[PDB]
């Protein structure tokens, strides 16, 4: 059940649960960026991680940013074996640019359990 | 563990319904009329609170008909097991038509997603 | 755990992982379609599937199409008992039309584990 986190620069922040019982770990921007109104952006984190066996890491939205700033996460599927820098894709569905500073929390990581070793069987009909 | 506890906060709430014993999610119903403006967003009241099973969180996920026919996308959507407030549905309207919601309309579904909720974070110099 | 796939036409492609340890099975368009700028569309796949017991099929976005083309999946909850054709609903949040050709990978299927046998208990307080 280990979540291994690698901080790639001094600007990274270890992901943190917002509360003791939160489903997700908040993910912090490591560099300023603005997500334009009715536009999108890719936020740097300067982190890598290896999620637990049996999961993938889902980059999910924070509800406050959704309501107040019209922000939704895009993409969001991080494989357990990914060792590159994790990036957060954000869409801004509002009419106001959304300014992000280093150290702002921009999403939350959820360790989603999945079946990642299914046997695929082709059949004539599911019926 | 295999119990979903549901608190109704108003007479106009609806207990979420699966219907088919093998559907993924429980339908979530608006408890108050609301209009989601075109190219805009809104927060739908449900007048329910719930506690999902241990080892899950509640994901507010889209109904399929609304996405195609109305340009509606479900936003936010992560409900913690220990949340006791009113559950609200965040909807974005990416179409050019306002989307009218009436009390009793199905607006989303709740999926009890299994997660690792007790991981230990280990900070390492390299994942290699 | 078995993922059963029904191919409804010769234009369908059996879903494939992008690599041996990918989380998701890439889903292929079976017919050309254009997703309009700032609008949405529905991609045919000409497949049906029955996911493993204990899961549902989530139609999740690919990161490249998100960044490059402004594409987000919509809807995307495939119940284990759904036997119809699975279509991929795409939102295009960009101001550019997105053209899809038969055989393009347009989304990824994730076999998400869930509690699908909970019992509802109505209580006066949590
Ligand atoms: O779609 C949602 C999302 C969340 N909520 C509620 C339940 C959830 O547990 C709580 C917090 O969600 P987030 O962690 O996504 N919001 P945020 O990080 O902005 O605020 P918080 O400080 O509460 O964590 O808000 C909803 O009612 N509907
Ligand atoms: O939001 C994301 C999504 C993915 N990623 C990284 C990790 C993930 O494992 C990797 C691949 O994700 P996808 O399969 O969604 N992208 P795509 O299918 O476009 O590229 P690939 O050929 O690498 O599979 O990109 C992020 O950093 N942020
Ligand atoms: O992206 C999707 C979403 C759903 N579907 C299929 C599978 C799913 O199990 C079935 C029903 O989806 P919803 O609960 O999302 N749609 P809704 O509640 O509007 O209508 P229905 O009465 O058909 O369930 O539609 C797709 O093919 N693609
Ligand atoms: Mg939070
Ligand atoms: Mg439904
Ligand atoms: Mg991929």
DSSP per-residue letters across B30-63: -SS-EEE-TTEEEEEE--EEEEPPTTEEEEEE--
Residues with CB under 6 A from ligand 1: A 18, 62-64; B 60, 76-80, 83, 87-88, 90
Residue B70 Cα distances to A119, B89, C71, C99, angstroms? 36, 16, 17, 22
- Judge contact between A101 and A29, C-beta under 8 A: yes
Strands (DSSP E) contained in C61-118 are 71-74, 77-78, 88-92, 98-100, 105-113
Residue among A86, A103, A95 at smallest CA distance from A35: A95
Specify the experimental method: X-ray
Say if strands C119-123 and B3-8 run parallel, antiparallel, or are unpaired: parallel
Alpha-carbon span C5 to C14, nearest angstrom = 7
Within 13 Å, how many C-alpha atoms sit on residue B48's CB side?
29
The residues, ordered by sequence, that sit 6+ positions from B16 with a Cβ below 8 Å of its Cβ are B4, B6, B26, B27, B28, B29, B48, B50, B110, C120
Q: Which atom of ligand 3 is nearest to the CA of B65?
A: 19
CATH number of the domain where residue A16 is located: 2.70.40.10
A32 lines ligand 2 (CB under 6 A): no
CA dihedral sign, ordered C20, A116, A3, A49: positive
- Closest to A67 in 3D by CA, of A88, A44, A93: A93
Gap between the Cα atoms of B49 and B6, Å rounded? 6
Three-state secondary-structure class, residue C44? coil
DSSP per position, B65-83: HHHHHH-EEE---EE-TT-
Which run of H or E residues covers position B29? strand B25-29
Q: Among B35, A7, A122, which Cα is nearest to C13's?
A: A122
Q: Do the bridges between strand B78-79 and strand B34-36 make them parallel or antiparallel, or are there none, so unpaired?
A: unpaired
Paired residues of B120 in beta bridges: A2
CA B18 to CA B28: how far, in whole Å? 10
**In B, which residues are within 8 Å of A54 by CB distance?**
116
Residue A118 CB contacts under 8 Å (≥ 6 apart), including other chains: C1, C2, C3, C51, C52, C111
Best of B27, B64, B89, B91 for a ligand 3 pocket test (most atoms within 8 Å of beta carbon) = B64
Domain extent, residue A73, equals 1-127
Number of separate domains in chain B: 1
- Where do we find the tokens 């569905």? A93
Output the CA–CA distances (angstroms, integers) from residue B84 to B123, C33, C91, in the order listed: 32, 44, 33
C-beta separation of C86 from C107 below 8 A? no
**Residue A94 known to bind ligand:** no
């Amino acid at each position: 059940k280990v979540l291994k986190i690698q901080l790639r620069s001094a600007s990274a922040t270890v992901p943190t649960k917002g509360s003791a019982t939160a489903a997700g770990y908040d993910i912090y921007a490591s560099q300023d960026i603005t997500i334009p109104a009715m536009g999108q952006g890719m936020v740097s984190t300067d982190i890598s991680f290896t999620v637990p066996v049996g999961t993938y890491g889902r980059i999910a939205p924070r509800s406050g940013l959704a309501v107040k700033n019209g922000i939704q996460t895009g993409a969001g599927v991080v494989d357990r074996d990914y060792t590159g820098e994790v990036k957060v894709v954000l869409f801004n569905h509002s009419q106001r640019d959304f300014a992000i500073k280093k150290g702002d929390r921009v999403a939350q990581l959820i360790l989603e359990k999945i079946v990642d070793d299914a046997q695929i069987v082709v059949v004539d009909s599911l019926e």
